[PDB]
Amino acid sequence: SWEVGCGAPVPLVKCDENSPYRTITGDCNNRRSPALGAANRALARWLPAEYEDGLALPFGWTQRKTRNGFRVPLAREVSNKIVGYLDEEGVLDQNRSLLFMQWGQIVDHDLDFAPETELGSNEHSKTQCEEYCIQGDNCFPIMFPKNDPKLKTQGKCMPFFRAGFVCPTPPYQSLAREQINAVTSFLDASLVYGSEPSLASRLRNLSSPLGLMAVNQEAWDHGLAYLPFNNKKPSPCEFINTTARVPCFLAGDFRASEQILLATAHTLLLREHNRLARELKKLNPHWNGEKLYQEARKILGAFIQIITFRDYLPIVLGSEMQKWIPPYQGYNNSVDPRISNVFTFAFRFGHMEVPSTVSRLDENYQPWGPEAELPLHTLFFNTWRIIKDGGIDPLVRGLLAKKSKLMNQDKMVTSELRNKLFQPTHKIHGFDLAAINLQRCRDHGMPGYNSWRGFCGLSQPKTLKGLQTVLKNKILAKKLMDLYKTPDNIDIWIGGNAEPMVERGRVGPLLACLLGRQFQQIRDGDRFWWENPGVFTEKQRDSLQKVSFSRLICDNTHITKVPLHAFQANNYPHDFVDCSTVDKLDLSPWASREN
Ligand code: HEM
Ligand SMILES: *[C@@H]1O[C@H](CO)[C@@H](O[C@@H]2O[C@H](CO)[C@@H](O[C@H]3O[C@H](CO)[C@@H](O)[C@H](O)[C@@H]3O)[C@H](O)[C@H]2NC(C)=O)[C@H](O)[C@H]1NC(C)=O
Ligand SMILES: *[C@@H]1O[C@H](CO)[C@@H](O[C@@H]2O[C@H](CO)[C@@H](O[C@H]3O[C@H](CO)[C@@H](O)[C@H](O)[C@@H]3O)[C@H](O)[C@H]2NC(C)=O)[C@H](O)[C@H]1NC(C)=O
Ligand SMILES: *[C@@H]1O[C@H](CO)[C@@H](O[C@@H]2O[C@H](CO)[C@@H](O)[C@H](O)[C@H]2NC(C)=O)[C@H](O)[C@H]1NC(C)=O
Ligand SMILES: *[C@@H]1O[C@H](CO)[C@@H](O[C@@H]2O[C@H](CO)[C@@H](O)[C@H](O)[C@H]2NC(C)=O)[C@H](O)[C@H]1NC(C)=O
Ligand SMILES: CC(=O)Oc1ccccc1C(=O)O
Ligand SMILES: [Ca+2]
């Protein structure tokens, strides 16, 4: 007895059916089931949700009710006893650049977003939750354990709001609570253009027929464009330096200004759209604005898919790559392309790959300025350092020359994110991303670690000795048992991230399985996948294979020296070469005659 009635919170419309362009909402990708993969719908469930009361309450909500007979430990204690570390030396990945971490965040934001609950404009819940830590409704505070230094200095808890769910959002109940994915599931560049009709339109430059995206009008970066500023005050980007008063950037995705390197990436993409756009007009002068926009847009979608599948996943999945994502075989209308709820947690392996600093390099790739190396936390929601401190070129050089942080069992997440994370909404640099993650696993009703091992067909340890062998680490296995009492209670996020990495990969077996299946699906169930016969012509695909992130760089900055393989670790100047030597995307194949 199914239930697929429930729905409304969804912006729907009719389909075009022989239209060559994806919709903004993702609707109509699948002809037989039109809303599959669309934005503003529930995340798919690969396993049933697991709640304290079986429907909506998170585990750890009712301090008396246990999970399999035990109390589940506070997310912050786990963060404190297993995730933190003090010494940053020796923690960098010797063969993965800072761009490796950054692309991951970009693919992520393209695929999923479960925003927090509102009903809170002009709200005191907004305060009944930060001031007094009273648990209730959508307020599910992260309590501080005894002996936490934040006690003495911050309060009794860290505010936290539950994720949105469907059918409504206010006081609801009935079936099992399913969170929302506010963006399209397909890998389609929805982060550049938006996932809603409204925002997509406001992002475009409609005062002219060139099919370009709107650009900042207050500042330019050496003639090159900037994303436009965001309308909405109170702005967090201006709260961090009330003298600079530079607002956040307005983009296709709302998290765009979370950190300066993510904003840099968004800018690089915006720029490529316009470039691609003025170039296409030049070869087909009669094309109107719509055609220029959709056509460029489609090129860029094919770009992100290529870099992701050809250059990125192979070094995340490693030797497991082929075990989950076999050679492409054509569109499969039976493959469900929805992003699963657990994937949004599996993809968070990236948080343990973020180093404590971001650097800026001048043109010889040497420290730019005196205070060239900044601590990560000073850059959450920091747009002023771009606009008033050198543009994006210095940051892009850092992306190519610095390394990512390597995941390590005794040194998982940097304190820059574990104690000094900045929320939009709040006023301090004192949040814990690691604790938020664990708290979100429960909010989302995730099955424990062992449920997912079974799912992936991997052993399921029940004993300390069992866990030691799987984690191949006596001590961590130990900390994990003292806190969880049973491996069946270990939250998927930490359980999955504590495993050793597979050969040539950056994630372990459980994650490789969870990541691998998800990507296989968004590829096989995407009617618009770039390799799908009829989407692009044979000659257009031969052109699209020469796309390189190195090139994306050369064409949209004033950097003339770039690595050939921008994801592996490269040393300047030996591994860098003149832009003049890098393959360019050939567009003549897009030229469409007449008569
Ligand atoms: C600061 C933050 C980052 C870097 C300086 C950062 C980075 C990443 C990378 C590199 C990811 C994948 C390779 C990745 C995935 C996901 N993130 Fe994270 N991220 C920073 C900050 C946050 C915050 C805060 C959240 C929200 C947590 C919450 O539950 O409230 C966050 C989320 C996610 C996320 C879930 C997305 C969703 O579907 O709602 C990832 C898959 N990041 N980040
Ligand atoms: C740093 O990471 C690099 C990537 O993980 C790695 O180099 C890669 O090694 C693989 C080994 O299989 C090779 O991969 C390519 O080999 C042929 C081309 O000769 C292709 O047809 C294959 O499909 C495959 O893509 C490459 O030599 C290289 N891959 C790339 C994309 O550059 C380095 O070995 C790592 N450094 C160290 C010290 O381990
Ligand atoms: C808030 O943003 C301010 C910039 O908008 C920033 O101050 C700026 O940064 C430095 C001061 O530390 C100045 O630049 C340096 O270079 C000039 C070159 O002309 C030299 O004369 C000085 O050595 C100078 O330090 C900027 O001019 C300065 N701008 C202003 C208006 O002060 C603040 O530091 C930011 N505040 C925080 C807390 O981040
Ligand atoms: C929309 O596009 C138009 C045309 O490309 C932009 O107008 C040009 O802006 C630059 C700098 O202002 C200059 O070349 C001219 O002032 C404009 N040229 C023309 C032909 O109008 C305009 O800036 C864009 N609008 C937005 C909001 O980005
Ligand atoms: C298209 O995708 C479907 C769904 O993933 C594949 O279906 C599996 O195929 C086997 C053999 O027919 C079935 O017995 C299983 O029930 C299916 N497994 C699952 C988990 O659904 C199918 O193989 C794909 N077909 C092509 C031609 O690519
Ligand atoms: C999802 C992500 O990367 O988002 C954020 C994290 C901390 C604070 C703000 C945001 C945001 O999107 O506004
Ligand atoms: Ca998308």
From Swiss-Prot:
SS bonds (residue pairs): C6-C167, C15-C28, C129-C139, C133-C157, C237-C248, C456-C513, C554-C579
Biological classification of the source: Eukaryota, Metazoa, Chordata, Craniata, Vertebrata
Sites annotated Transition state stabilizer: R255
Note: Thiocyanate (SCN(-)) and hypothiocyanite (OSCN(-)) are bound in the distal heme cavity. The iodide ion (I(-)) occupies a position which is stabilized by the interactions with heme moiety, His-109, Arg-255 and Glu-258. Hydrogen peroxide is held between the heme iron and His-109.
A biological process term (GO) from this entry: detection of chemical stimulus involved in sensory perception of bitter taste
Localization terms from the record: Secreted; Cytoplasm
Gene field: LPO
Residues carrying a glycan: N95, N205, N241, N332
Annotated active site: H109 (proton acceptor)
Key words of the record: Antibiotic, Antimicrobial, Calcium, Cleavage on pair of basic residues, Cytoplasm, Disulfide bond, Glycoprotein, Heme, Hydrogen peroxide, Iron, Metal-binding, Nitration, Oxidoreductase, Peroxidase, Phosphoprotein, Secreted, Signal
Catalytic activity: 2 a phenolic donor + H2O2 = 2 a phenolic radical donor + 2 H2O; thiocyanate + H2O2 + H(+) = hypothiocyanous acid + H2O; iodide + H2O2 = hypoiodite + H2O
Modified residues (Phosphoserine): S198
Cellular component, GO annotation: basolateral plasma membrane; cytoplasm; extracellular space
Membership in a protein family: Belongs to the peroxidase family. XPO subfamily.
This protein's record includes keyword Kinase: no
Residues that bind Ca(2+): D110, T184, F186, D188, S190
Modified residue annotations for 3'-nitrotyrosine: Y365
UniProt keyword annotation of Calcium present: yes
Protein name according to UniProt: Lactoperoxidase
Names of the cofactor(s): Ca(2+); heme b
Residues of the full protein shown: 118 to 712 of 712
Purpose: Heme-containing oxidoreductase which catalyzes the conversion of thiocyanate (SCN(-)) into antimicrobial agent hypothiocyanous acid (OSCN(-)) in the presence of hydrogen peroxide (H2O2). Also involved in the conversion of iodide (I(-)) into hypoiodite (IO(-)) in the presence of H2O2. Responsible for the inactivation of a wide range of micro-organisms and hence, important component of defense mechanism. The lactoperoxidase-SCN(-)-H2O2 system shows antibacterial properties against some streptococci strains. The lactoperoxidase-I(-)-H2O2 system shows antibacterial properties against E.coli.
